[PDB]
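Hello again,

I reread your note about wanting to compare the complex against the isolated chains. To keep things tidy I'm splitting this into two emails, and this first one only covers the full assembly. Below are the input lines as submitted, including protein chains and any nucleic acid or small-molecule components. They are followed by the predicted structure of everything together. The single-chain runs will come separately.
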Amino acid sequence: PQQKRSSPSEGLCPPGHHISEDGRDCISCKYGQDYSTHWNDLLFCLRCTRCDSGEVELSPCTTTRNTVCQCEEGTFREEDSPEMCRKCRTGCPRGMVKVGDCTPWSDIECVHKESGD
Amino acid sequence: PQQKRSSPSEGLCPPGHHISEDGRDCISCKYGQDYSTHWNDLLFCLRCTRCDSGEVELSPCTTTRNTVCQCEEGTFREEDSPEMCRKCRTGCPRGMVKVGDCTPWSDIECVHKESGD
Amino acid sequence: PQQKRSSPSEGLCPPGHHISEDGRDCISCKYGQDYSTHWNDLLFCLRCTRCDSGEVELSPCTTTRNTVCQCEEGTFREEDSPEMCRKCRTGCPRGMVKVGDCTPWSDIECVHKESGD
Amino acid sequence: PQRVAAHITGTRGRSNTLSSPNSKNEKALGRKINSWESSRSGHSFLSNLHLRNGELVIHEKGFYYIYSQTYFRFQEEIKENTKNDKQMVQYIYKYTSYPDPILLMKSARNSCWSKDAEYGLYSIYQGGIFELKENDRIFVSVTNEHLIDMDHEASFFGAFLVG
Amino acid sequence: PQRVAAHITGTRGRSNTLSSPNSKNEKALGRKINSWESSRSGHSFLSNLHLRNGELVIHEKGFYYIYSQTYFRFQEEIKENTKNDKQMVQYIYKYTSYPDPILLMKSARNSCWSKDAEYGLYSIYQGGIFELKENDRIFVSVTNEHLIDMDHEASFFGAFLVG
Amino acid sequence: PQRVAAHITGTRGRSNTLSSPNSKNEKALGRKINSWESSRSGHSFLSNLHLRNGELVIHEKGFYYIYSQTYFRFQEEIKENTKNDKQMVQYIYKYTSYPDPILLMKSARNSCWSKDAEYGLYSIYQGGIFELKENDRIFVSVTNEHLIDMDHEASFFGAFLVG
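Full-complex prediction:
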């Protein structure tokens, strides 16, 4: 009933750690470098992501959560454009009115994508 | 001198069929799915092709012939452009006259690709 | 103290040659086809390069030196554009003056890449 | 001796299977290609590996060269003021004994032209070696899945035991 | 033990061989590349496979990872009203004991720009695993064969026994 | 038995290492990628091969399938009268017991659009088989190294013993 640091529960280590090779200890992930979000048996924690020059960091990487990055103001990203933030349109085309402003996850929304006038 | 369905001639099955693995019978291809055009020893018939949205079907796939597709009116295809039908030109450039109309295998033919006027 | 043609020094053959497989003689490279510039133990000489249609040959391939090609007049090549010669600009943009002429290794040099007027 | 490899291909017209039971990924980018054929054909096979919901399942632990080719083929009719600009990305993931899928490889292309442009042909192939444990699962996910041409010679997915 | 593989490359300047005896395919799309070098060099080789009319001939039945890279390189000087738009396609075929060639893989690219565009660089690589029988023959065919750069580091064709 | 293979990847943020001691090539085109990680990770490894100054060092003579993927990713803001036109080339070289590096493979792409174009995504993958002698060294060099995205799933380099 006496111990020290970390041992695997049912063969799984806690978030913020990874498991030893065969010897079985639970090693901590390195803050700012890698992490693990769930109980696991990874031999290596997961590498943190670095926000690129077109993004801003909302929260840093921790041994428990990956960095959270977001497109910089004036640009946005969607499900089919995960690779590069796209420049938001300044205004709607001739004949169409706003209705939706630029978000980090969406360009401007313009109406006459049905409506009268 | 008594039989049933299909047996391979000199180790080859007829068009519309393929040969059994090692056991050797001649299995029929599945109409609308696959085919074979010549006597053969394929373990699998050849898959039919499906015409895409820019093509029209001239004749369906049969156990014996692959589907026959052709570019849709207003578009054409040639030896170096087998992947996508290309839009036919509406008219000849300034100074050149027709001579050749748009075909499924050719754009318009314009003259002054030598000639006087 | 009597010999014939070519034998390897300390296991290396001279420029213009390559070494025999295991049997060890020094075979000459084929002029106009391949070469070798340094003492070596290649089992095959290096293939000569053929200047392409946008280049001019300054010197031919010899058993000892590779062909030397250069971009044709009016075009140029630089460290980040080794694949295709790029067309030299005819003149500088509005407001900028020459200072540097087109070379085989450089486009025109235009000033107001800082300066007064 | 015993060969460990697979090469599975699109189903041409059946293109996408899924249906209602379908099958998916998770925190994975793009959308999982779920329609690979699962049986022997004259152009595909599975030897000591099997398919489940579009994912190749590993039986023997080891180093695997994994690869995939995905053909983005589309005819496009733009209009007025731009909105057309496509990012064509092929992702290769693995599911191990960890809740979330882990990216192994990505390869991307972006459409160019705009307005004055009739169509686009973009075949994307990538491959590389990764260590996998028995029961690890690998799949392919892509953006703009609606532009993928699934003829079997065009889009495919495979792997084989290295060394 | 006994290695089964090959890697053959373009012949640089000799670019295209063919001549009068040449050699071809059939119902095959594009045009067969017939000029691969057929002997040992410091960058190519054939081990338990040989070349015939541009086609690699299989000696040992099995699963083969087959691949090819074809470099489309061209300087272009368009003119007046368009007509320029190129489809660059690399096809990989096999001839078995069946009269017609059977496509195994295709990979395509289309030129983009137009008018305002000085040149194009398009290297196309594809590869995948296929089961082949002894004496099966594999070759590569391409569209716009006149735009292919055959320097040996640029265009090549190969295969090796998998598993 | 004993596995001979490797797969090494970019270091994400550390992107480029080099520093003052760095390491280079020679008559080699482009610039050597010197920042591949040199140790075990959950996405890279070295088995009977090792890394030195960005170069993979061969231990066992043989036929090797060598490959590399390099992701050119860039946001671009052109201006007035053109000057923008990029040649994206990936080179794969070997150093043998010969003074100068010898090209094994190249693969190229050129940017298209111009002026009216916001960004470019160009993943380049190539691979092929070459005979190498013990102590031969292989590396990758590229043009526009400043546009390379070194996230590990994006850019990598590897090889394995064939046959």
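For quick reference: Chain E has one domain: 1-163.

B.
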